[PDB]
Structure 1
Amino acid sequence: HGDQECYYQDDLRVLSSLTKKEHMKGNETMLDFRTSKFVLRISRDSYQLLKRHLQEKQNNQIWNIVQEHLYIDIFDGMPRSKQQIDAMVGSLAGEAKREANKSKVFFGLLKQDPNAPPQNRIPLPELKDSDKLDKIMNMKETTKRVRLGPDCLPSICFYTFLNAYQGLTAVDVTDDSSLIAGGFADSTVRVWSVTPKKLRSVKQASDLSLIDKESDDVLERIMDEKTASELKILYGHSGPVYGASFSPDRNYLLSSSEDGTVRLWSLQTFTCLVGYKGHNYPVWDTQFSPYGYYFVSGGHDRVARLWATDHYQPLRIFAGHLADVNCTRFHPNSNYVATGSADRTVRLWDVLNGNCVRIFTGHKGPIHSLTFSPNGRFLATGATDGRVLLWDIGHGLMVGELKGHTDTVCSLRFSRDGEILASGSMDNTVRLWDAIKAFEDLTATGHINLPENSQELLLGTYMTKSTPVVHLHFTRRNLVLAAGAYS
């Protein structure tokens, strides 16, 4: 155990405790490690030296262990440099095969784009007249949207939680910067209005029965003014609320917690509507679809479920990870779900057929943040090693590594144009990366040769006063919002 790599140190101390058989018969992570196959991507120039040392009968038993417990995925390339092999390894069942990263992925946006999926591929919901009224005032915000680039650096407005002696575990902001949710360790969700417009519930059923519909202003006549606060507390989780997700129509808050339930809170009645009990284990993340019907929740039981807000049971179970599904993110076309995890892999999952279409390995710690580019062509992932790895989706080969952060990168977001990727970590820093010069260049070998572009891609660091940057949000006029819970 001493002649192992330094990034396996937390993996070996779980093995030093395992000495008996019955200790391992109830671990369920080393039980799935013993039955699976390590993938072990090696080149054909090095596999010829390996097979000329194993096919002989002088060794004849370590060759039997290799061909029983290890897959070997061979690819043709020029040999990678030690600092290029270091960039793309670090995961159990590491460096997956290129035959997994060759499926056709519809990474384009919906409405021609040849990479775009059809509208009737995934049965997405209709666009209502109130939802069409939202996009009318959304493009008024896009009129004032600034082009950020490397010159016009954005202004960051930090929304710190001051007291927060119950530990803040989850933040979400609506797509228009109007609500901010807070998931806390005292089993509460707290919605704050940030615009000068108090949070109102709709009137009770006796008050709605006396008013008339039709009219012209029934989206204002139903809002109760007797209930109007700058803060609404939501009770009902029996555990710390780890995920928080708004719906794009600004109703329907989502929250997941340690008790194994995902909860759908209304934002018109400010009560709980549904409790989705599919996990028996802590659900570490949830997110609504960007069209607002489906939602994905990943938990401690090493799956991610796809729900639809209409069924008590899920529709898709994404069950290929070997550890906890820490993150679950939808694609901007919502045909693909990216699930980062604690076994140092990021996996894209097609919503049709539930198949894993991409496997992104190369992180050294559990992935704690994912985000997609607004193009849909790229994916930024962050983990506990302080590395932000930028992945292609049509190709799925990494090499672009942003390595400025020190501690766990817990929040990533691209700009509304895509000009800047913002990264927030436990180093109490909000780093800004040039997300245009990072993708400027973009196979038959599976890699593009690692450069060290991190210094060039930095635009600023922005140290925060003792406050870990839990969330990062981009206003539609390209203004960075961040929320932290000052410690």
Structure 2
Amino acid sequence: LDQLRQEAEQLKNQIRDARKACADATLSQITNNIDPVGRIQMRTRRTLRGHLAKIYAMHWGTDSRLLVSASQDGKLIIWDSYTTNKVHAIPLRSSWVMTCAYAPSGNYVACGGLDNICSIYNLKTNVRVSRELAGHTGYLSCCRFLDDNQIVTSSGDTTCALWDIETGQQTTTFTGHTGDVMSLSLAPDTRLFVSGACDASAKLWDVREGMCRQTFTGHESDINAICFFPNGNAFATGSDDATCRLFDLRADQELMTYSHDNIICGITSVSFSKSGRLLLAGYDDFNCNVWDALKADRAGVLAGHDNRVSCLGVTDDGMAVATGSWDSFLKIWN
């Protein structure tokens, strides 16, 4: 055991030099004369309301029009962004929900929280539970619909697992992300997904198998959120070190770190723009800082929330960005 423990260290040293060996130049160096992003003077084009308590989760839909949201009131509200009407209000068996998800088909909505079970609500029939999952050891942190039939989850047990409504049992669980996985995202090509945990590192996983292939790291704190580039080739992890950063698959290393001297609050949600030029990122300073993804320019500010912003999302159509804050409000920015 002692020899194996010492042997494990020397493998990473070569792997650490592998990033150095493949490194060519800093992305900043790569992008010096690239067109300036310009001042995006975005304003508020909608302001939804009706949530009793603070919002923790919000996720758009593939139909570009409906968006779901969850709060400590124990209710899920489905909103029509175009017309600011309320479609469904979903009571929950529990009252401590920490994540929500929307089916691309639109017939189901996932919700989970401190309860070990995240509910898969049936939306097409008001709304009832299609299936309540078997459960994990801790609390579900982020739920996403890989497809209408497969569900991927992140819990408080350093455990992620692909699910299945048909069998009602986790088909292929995933283990290895020490700490507490709190973030999860899916690739536009639905065969990969990564996660972020309190281990100050993120790991890349393959759905068809159950073993991770890559492990991006360097964060000075716990990762609270993550999202993928429009192509399946980049990342954006937002941790509590007040520094989002860009990652690359083939590079297997960070490209640029997004931080500003007056920015010490931290990050709660992160999302890209449709063109991949902008890195929309919320902050615990009750603000939403937009950044040039191609560059590192911290250009584009989006203020107007009274309390912390915790959830952020960009429509698949790319028209508008949505922010939900602890103020119990959720307003669409375009």
Tell me which interval the TM-score lies in, with the shorter structure as reference length.
Answer: 0.7 to 0.9
Query: How far apart, in 2, do the equivalents of 1:319 and 1:67 lie?
Result: 20
Aligned position for 1:168: 55
Match of 1:282 in 2: 139
SS of the equivalent of 1:71 reads helix
SS in structure 1 at match of 2:9: coil
CA contact (8 A) 2:39 2:300 kept: no
Whole-angstrom CA distance in 1 between matches of 2:270 and 2:201: 17
Work out whether 1:432 is the aligned partner of 2:290: yes
Give the Å deviation of 1:473. Answer: 2.5
1:74–1:412 distance in 2 versus 1, CA, 3 Å = closer
Q: Which amino acid aligns with 1:420?
A: L
**Alpha-carbon distance between aligned partners in 2 of 1:260 and 1:159, rounded to the nearest angstrom:** 35
Query: Could you tell me the TM-score, scaled by structure 1's length?
Result: 0.58
CA–CA separation in structure 1 for the residues paired with 2:132 and 2:19: 35
Residue 27 of structure 2 is matched in structure 1 by none
Contact 2:205 2:213 in 1 (8 A): yes
RMSD: 3.0
Aligned counterpart for 1:312 among listed residues 161, 168, 175: 168
Deviation, structure 1 residue 393: 1.1
Aligned to 2:307: 467
Helix, strand or coil at the partner of 1:459:
coil
1:191 positional shift: 1.9
Runs of at least 5 residues in structure 1 that lack an aligned partner in the other structure: 1-34, 36-63, 77-95, 103-147, 199-229, 438-453
Alpha-carbon distance change, 274 to 423 in structure 1, aligned in 2, over 3 angstroms: same
Q: Distance in 2 between matches of 1:384 and 1:191?
A: 30
Residue 268 of structure 2 aligns to a residue in which SS? strand
**What per-residue deviation string (whole Å, max 9, x for no partner) do you get for residues 105-156 of structure 1?**
xxxxxxxxxxxxxxxxxxxxxxxxxxxxxxxxxxxxxxxxxxx971372635
| C-alpha distance 271-74 of structure 1, shift in aligned 2 (>3 A) | closer
The letter of the residue matching 2:176 is G
For the residues of structure 2 that align with 1:188 and 1:69, how far apart are their CA atoms? 51
1-structure distance, mates of 2:12, 2:199: 22
Question: In structure 2, what is the equivalent of residue 391 of structure 1?
Answer: 247
Give CA-to-partner distance per residue, 1:77-100, whole Å, 9 cap, x none.
Answer: xxxxxxxxxxxxxxxxxxx75789
1:408 maps onto 2:266 in alignment: yes
Query: Alignment identity in percent?
Result: 22
CA contact (8 A) 1:171 1:244 kept: yes
Displacement of 1:436 in angstroms is 2.3
Give aligned pairs, total. Answer: 311
The 1:74–1:67 alpha-carbon spacing in structure 2 relative to 1, beyond 3 Å, is same
Q: What are the residue-to-residue correspondences of 1:85-484 with 2, within 5 Å?
A: 150-151=37-38, 153=40, 155-157=42-44, 164-196=51-83, 230-269=86-125, 270-289=127-146, 291-404=147-260, 405-437=263-295, 454=296, 457-475=297-315, 476-484=317-325
Structure whose CA Rg is larger: 1
Mark the runs of 5 or more structure 2 residues left unpaired by the alignment. Answer: 22-34, 329-334
1:483 alignment partner AA: G
Aligned residue type for 1:411 = S
Paired AA for residue 294 in structure 2: I
Deviation string 1:164-191 (CA, Å, 9 cap, x unpaired) is 4533222222234422322122332222
Q: Whose helix proportion is higher, 1 or 2?
A: 1
